Each structure stands twice: as structure tokens, then as C-alpha cells.
């Protein structure tokens, strides 16, 4: 008996060498089946972006509720973001955020000097919901410094 997730989630990938959907998973068992067979951020190519968003939310202009919403971002040294990425995924698919209904998905951006992980959220103007997400994410990660919020 598989363990169903509250939402289905879709991995998307932007290959540097644009944003393509990879696979939509709907159980804990399916999550690990895919996660254990794709590169962790430490082994992704520079300028690659790996997305995990709720099913039927595209990380694109197509869904302005998320595309024009809030973004919480954390910077990691290059190649030091693997655990932060996994813990972000487990917190999302496990529905562990008190205000998780505002969470659209997360993305890891592998760049030359740093790895970035962002959570895209709806309702950026809901100060209380955004603060709750940012505070909980810092707890799930236990990060010492910079958790940055952006609103368009």
C-alpha cells in the first residue's frame, strides 16, 4: 500500500547545455523512486535549474498567481546545497508548512559561485503567511544567516 501525498508534484528541469516537465509523482514511494535517480544539486551542470512544483502549477508566466507572487531564497556555497534541497522537498511534499496552502513549489539554481534554493509562494501581500513560511523554512533548514524575501 503506497503512501499518497496530499498533492501531486511535478519535477521540471531547465537544461543549460526551456523549462521541461520531467515526471509527476503522487506518493512517497514514487518520490524516492525519482529522487534517488536524478542528480543532487552538487552534481548538476552550472546554470541548471531543477523545479518541484504542485501538479498543474507551472513555474512559468502561465500561472501568475505563483509567477507574480512571493519568493523566499537561501544561498549556499556551490555544491553545499544537497541537504537543504532534500529537506525543502520533504517539508513541502510532507505538508509540514503551517501556511503550505500558499506554497507553489521550490527550485534549486546551480550557479558558478553559489547554489540558490527558492520557495515560490502565492499571496505575497499576506504578511503573516509569508513570515510563517520564512520562519518555518529557517527551522526546517536551521540556517545561520540569509533567508531573503522578494515580491514583484
Amino acid at each position: 500500500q503506497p503512501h499518497p501525498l496530499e498533492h501531486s508534484w511535478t519535477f521540471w528541469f531547465d537544461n543549460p547545455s526551456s523549462i521541461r516537465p520531467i515526471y509527476t509523482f503522487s506518493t512517497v514511494e514514487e518520490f524516492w523512486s525519482v529522487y534517488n535517480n536524478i542528480h543532487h544539486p552538487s552534481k548538476l551542470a552550472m546554470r541548471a535549474d531543477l523545479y518541484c512544483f504542485k501538479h498543474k502549477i507551472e513555474p512559468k508566466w502561465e500561472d501568475p498567481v505563483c509567477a507574480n507572487g512571493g519568493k523566499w531564497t537561501v544561498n549556499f556555497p556551490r555544491g553545499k546545497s544537497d541537504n537543504g534541497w532534500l529537506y525543502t522537498l520533504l517539508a513541502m511534499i510532507g505538508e509540514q508548512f503551517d501556511c503550505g496552502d500558499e506554497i507553489c513549489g521550490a527550485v534549486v539554481n546551480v550557479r558558478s559561485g553559489q547554489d540558490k534554493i527558492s520557495i515560490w509562494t502565492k499571496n505575497a501581500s499576506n504578511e503573516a503567511a509569508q513570515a510563517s513560511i520564512g520562519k518555518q523554512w529557517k527551522e526546517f533548514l536551521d540556517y545561520n544567516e540569509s533567508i531573503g524575501f522578494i515580491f514583484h
Binding site: 496530499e6 537544461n15 514511494e29 523512486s33 548538476l44 517539508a91 509540514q96
Partner: protein
């Protein structure tokens, strides 16, 4: 449906095989792990 991190992690090593309906196209070969099952 809520799952703690430790509960989710209990399954991690039990599912190493790619789903059979997972299509590995050429343009995403660079995403796949060095070793797949």
C-alpha cells in the same frame, strides 16, 4: 496527509528503481544520476 521528515526518510533506501513510466529523453540525460536502477 502529513508526513514528518523522519517518516519520509524511512522509505528512502527502499525505492531505488526509476518508475517504468519515467521517460528519459536525450535532452534530460544530464539530469539522471550517474548510477540508475
Amino acid at each position: 496527509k502529513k508526513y514528518s521528515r523522519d517518516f519520509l526518510l524511512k522509505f528512502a533506501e527502499q525505492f531505488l528503481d526509476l518508475p517504468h513510466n519515467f521517460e528519459v529523453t536525450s535532452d534530460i540525460e544530464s539530469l539522471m544520476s550517474t548510477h540508475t536502477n
